[PDB]
């Protein structure tokens, strides 16, 4: 973790993050054997085993019914559309009877079997037999003459356990029209997610990373329903494949640079905020807010979202004051007072009418902040205050620098008309 | 499903979709008889029945405590405001003791009764008695001398089955301030939703359509809590009324048409993207990304969200190169390399520095794509690549066309200033 404050545009770059970025998908297809419940009958009036069995029958019938510029919005749109279309394209193959029989056949005796689909994609199959096993071995033995109010209630309450996984999956597909937003524990256990990583074709290093960040693997991946085949419910889990890893990533963040250049204000905000990464030979920008998140020094992002942006674009950080690159900005007569909690220091914007201060848990007010932009490091203060709000600063330790330069809002005259503009290049605005 | 690539604007129209559109709300009001739990007492120390009863009592007390231009943002705003306001208006009637007694009286003998409120709106009422039935007969027969550690644990665990529905209803209204986001299975069972469809005044064809697409009926609809009355909890479920059905609908999609017109770029993107449907006697544009969604050939959209747009607006598809309609676009010196996966083909924008290719599973790179905008059909390729990124294409079979014409960014000169603009008519920008 390292950070730089760009005085010349009231902005910070936080550098030194490693990267984990999703380049691909590994499909894991689950054969959960529900067993042929559809004609199991209880001839015995309302009972625990009956109502579990009837919920189990109903869940199966229900599941048979269900089946599948502003850079931020476009990046969000493509990231979801590409991800689901990747999985559907796999679903289209494995739904074929040739493939369902192939998957079920290799699962006949081993609860994990690798296979190659007719469409050439390779998939790990696994079999969640435990429900069919309980129904066929355990439950069928205990039921006699179709009676289900049997007194050995341990059978009933244990049945209400073994079917929990199945029922939660029928929920999660039904509520999401066959495309779940995340891999619930019910689609793929932590044991099976560890197996899926250990079996996937990636480096032991990435395996150890993924074994250390299993929640990330779970959060970025998602599930698709293939269908009920012969009283068996077929569904596929896509785990992420992180084929670019520990490359440089940085987050650019900014707050309104303003000055009273004519007694009336002028202001500027950098629009290019968010995560940038070196993606093996070009910089990629991740503008959609759902794309990137950080666990530790890694940022985890999805390469389908990333708008590829020229390597020259970093020159907005070094010299937006002079660069020929069209740095995307907003400007206008709109002084806003705010803080941006960049991880090694809060940015502050502090303008007319708004009193500003910084403090500590012990010392009280350290200082009244000046008019203008300010950069309060994690070590300068514990709190910053604007108007009467209290903002708690981050307490992360790390190197900070200031790049000096009279802010763009102060070193250029604003264009007299149109003085307000949204998401324009600076060349248009000053 | 049929798709037209508008070369003149790096945009597609996918025609051929049919329509289902929510014109009204049909309300189903549920009387879930919890029974007079509030004075039931267990005199027998911590026990299964006691803690189920105490949860049942607490859930009731807890529920008694709770009661209720950029077209996209405004369309989402009005759609949600209209929905809740339409439902509260019904609540404001059925909450009155005159109506509560009328509803409860018609529900006395039959678990469904149609009734017309004093405020004239018609409603179907239904009674979920099963909890009161269990408590008042089954359970009370067992609770001898207020003892609750009775050995017939079948009662206790079956009690923990019946109350599941009630407790989930108190959860969902609590977490959503009496206005749930979607009709959970706990608010309205699939049987009760099918009954509500069969009872609602609509065509039998639409009854079949709704029975066929119950996930839409369930997820477009929502619940409102009325309140506890005399240890009975009253809540209303609003089902959609699809008064416009199987009309034409199309989705319009675009990617940046850039051109190297001066070695420096100019770019264009259509801002009018998204779903359009031909509501009876006028085209309607549905810009809110939450509202429209598709199952099979249908698309499902709330008519309250729809911005009624002049029929001339289709001229942006016919010839934005010549139309006098103010076709909303964004433009500027902001090349983006991206794909927009239209249902029958990827739009592919491929500009400076970024190498682009198309592939097939058997064949590898079919072709290196040219600079500019390219429309890779579902049958041209399986994959498209933008730098290192891989985008899976859709595999839907359908008809595609190309409407030839030199893209607007190549056939008009950009306005020298302001050269960046956001969401402007083309008249302003070229």
């Amino acid at each position, epitope marked *: 973790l390292k950070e730089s404050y760009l005085e010349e545009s009231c902005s910070t770059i936080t550098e030194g993050y*490693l*990267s984990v970025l999703r*380049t*691909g998908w590994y499909t894991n297809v689950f054969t959960l054997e529900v067993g042929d419940v559809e004609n199991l009958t209880c001839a015995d009036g309302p009972s625990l085993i009956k109502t579990e069995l009837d919920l189990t029958k109903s869940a199966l019938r229900e599941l048979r019914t269900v089946s599948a510029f502003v850079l931020g919005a476009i990046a969000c749109g493509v990231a979801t559309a590409a991800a689901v279309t990747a999985g559907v394209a796999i679903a289209k193959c494995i739904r074929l009877e040739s493939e369902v029989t192939a998957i079920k056949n290799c699962l006949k005796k081993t609860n994990e079997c*690798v296979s*190659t689909l007719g469409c050439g*994609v*390779r998939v790990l199959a696994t079999a969640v037999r435990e429900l069919k096993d309980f129904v066929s071995k355990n439950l069928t033995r205990a039921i006699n003459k179709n009676k289900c109010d049997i007194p050995d209630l341990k059978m009933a309450v244990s049945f209400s356990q073994f079917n929990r996984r199945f029922l939660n999956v029928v929920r999660q597909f039904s509520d999401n029209a066959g495309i779940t937003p995340a891999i619930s524990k019910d689609l793929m256990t932590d044991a099976e997610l560890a197996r899926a990583i250990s079996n*996937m*074709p*990636t*480096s*032991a*290093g*990435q395996i150890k990373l993924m074994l250390e960040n299993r929640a990330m693997v779970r959060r970025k991946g998602f599930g698709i329903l293939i269908g009920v085949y012969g009283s068996s419910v077929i569904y596929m889990v896509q785990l992420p*494949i*992180f*084929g*670019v*890893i*520990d*490359t*440089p990533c940085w987050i650019v963040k900014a707050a309104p640079s303003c000055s009273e250049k004519k007694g009336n204000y002028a202001c500027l905000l950098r629009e290019d905020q968010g995560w940038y990464c*070196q*993606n*093996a*030979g070009s910089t990629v920008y991740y503008p959609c807010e759902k794309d990137c998140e950080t666990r530790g020094d890694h940022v985890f992002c999805d390469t389908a979202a990333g708008i590829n942006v020229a*390597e020259q674009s970093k020159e907005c950080n070094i010299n937006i004051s002079t660069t020929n690159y069209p740095c995307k900005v907003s400007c206008g007569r709109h002084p806003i007072s705010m803080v941006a909690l960049s991880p090694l220091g809060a940015l502050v914007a502090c303008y007319k009418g708004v009193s500003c201060s910084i403090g500590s848990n012990r010392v009280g007010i350290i200082k009244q902040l000046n008019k203008g932009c300010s950069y309060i490091t994690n070590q300068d203060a514990d709190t910053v205050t604007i108007d009467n709000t209290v903002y708690q600063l981050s307490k992360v330790e790390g190197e900070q620098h200031v790049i000096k330069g009279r802010p763009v809002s102060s070193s250029f005259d604003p264009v007299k008309f149109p003085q307000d503009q949204f998401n324009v290049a600076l060349d248009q605005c000053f | 499903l049929k798709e037209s690539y508008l070369e003149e604007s790096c945009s597609t129209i996918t025609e051929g979709y049919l329509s289902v559109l929510r014109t009204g709300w049909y309300t189903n009001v549920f009387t879930l008889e919890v029974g007079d739990v509030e004075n039931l007492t267990c005199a027998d120390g911590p026990s299964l029945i006691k803690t189920e009863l105490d949860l049942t009592k607490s859930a009731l007390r807890e529920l008694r405590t709770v009661s209720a231009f950029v077209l996209g943002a405004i369309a989402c705003g009005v759609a949600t405001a209209a929905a809740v306001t339409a439902g509260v208006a019904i609540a404001k009637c059925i909450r009155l003791e005159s109506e509560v007694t009328a509803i409860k009286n018609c529900l006395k003998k039959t678990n469904e009764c149609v009734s017309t409120l004093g405020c004239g709106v018609r409603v179907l009422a239904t009674a979920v008695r099963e909890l009161k039935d269990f408590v008042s007969k089954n359970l009370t027969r067992a609770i001898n001398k207020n003892k609750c550690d009775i050995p017939d644990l079948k009662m206790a665990v079956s009690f923990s089955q019946f109350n599941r529905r009630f407790l989930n209803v108190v959860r969902q209204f609590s977490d959503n301030a009496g206005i749930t986001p979607a009709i959970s299975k706990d608010l309205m069972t699939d049987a009760e939703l099918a009954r509500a469809i069969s009872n609602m005044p609509t065509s039998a064809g639409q009854i079949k359509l709704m029975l066929e697409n119950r996930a839409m009926v369930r997820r477009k609809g929502f619940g409102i809590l009325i309140g506890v009355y005399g240890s009975s909890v009253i809540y209303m479920v609003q089902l959609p009324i699809f008064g416009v059905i199987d009309t034409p609908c199309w989705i319009v999609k675009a990617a940046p048409s850039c051109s190297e017109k001066k070695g420096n770029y100019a770019c264009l993107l259509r801002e009018d993207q998204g779903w359009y449907c031909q509501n009876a006697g006028s085209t309607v544009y549905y810009p809110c990304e939450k509202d429209c969604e598709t199952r099979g050939d249908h698309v499902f959209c709330d008519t309250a969200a729809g911005i009624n747009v002049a029929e001339q607006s289709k001229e942006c598809n016919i010839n934005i190169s010549t139309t006098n309609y103010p076709c909303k676009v964004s433009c500027g010196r902001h090349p983006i390399s991206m794909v927009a996966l239209s249902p029958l083909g990827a739009l592919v924008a491929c500009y400076k520095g970024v190498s682009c290719s198309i*592939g097939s599973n*058997r*064949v*590898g*790179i079919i072709k*290196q794509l040219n600079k500019g905008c390219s429309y890779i059909t579902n049958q041209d390729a399986d994959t498209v690549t933008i730098d*290192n990124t*891989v985008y899976q294409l859709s595999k839907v079979e359908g008809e595609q066309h190309v409407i030839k014409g030199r893209p607007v960014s190549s056939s008009f000169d950009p306005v020298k200033f302001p050269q960046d603009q956001f969401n402007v008519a083309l008249d302003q920008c070229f």
Partner: antibody
Amino acid sequence: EVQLVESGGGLVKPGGSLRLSCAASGFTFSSYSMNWVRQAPGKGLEWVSSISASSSYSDYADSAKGRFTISRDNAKTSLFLQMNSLRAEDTAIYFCARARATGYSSITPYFDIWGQGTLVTV
Amino acid sequence: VVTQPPSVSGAPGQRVTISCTGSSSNIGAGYDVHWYQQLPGTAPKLLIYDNNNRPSGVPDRFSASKSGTSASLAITGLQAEDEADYYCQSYDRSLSGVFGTGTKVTV
């Protein structure tokens, strides 16, 4: 133009040690994982050792494990192999290569620019 | 050990086929198979990556395929200018990078 241009080869006596330096140029060195690949004279290619983009992870062939050490410096642009305890069977040309992994089907690294190498002789 | 026919030959303009016989820590485990061309006394040239993909500047007459545990490189229009050592490559889950025994084409 990318070139990988190794220097620091020649003869080493058995049990001696030498530093190879795959100096890098014409590409954004921080972005790419790097590898050493060696060729015993006339024989087949052998991958020697691997370093991730920011020295976060590394891997070695058993022939190199414990003995050699791959390192990188992302200031300047250089790739090093400190070859402690070279054996006679290490007598080979050592190439470096720039490594790339289109992680869609698997992480199967392929080498897209190779250096000219130098003849580590033992 | 990824292993190959030690030598192959053909007449100018024949097809020749090079088979990278394959093992299931390294080809069967999913790792896609890459091919390099090395002229005598030169550094290797990448001819094929993924299982089949061809870089810019290949004469566009080389193709590859992976079967479930093996791969092949088909060389067509064979010139004397193609007479070279050809090693496939993959990743072995245990041994990391594994390079083949390197069939030499002869013309």
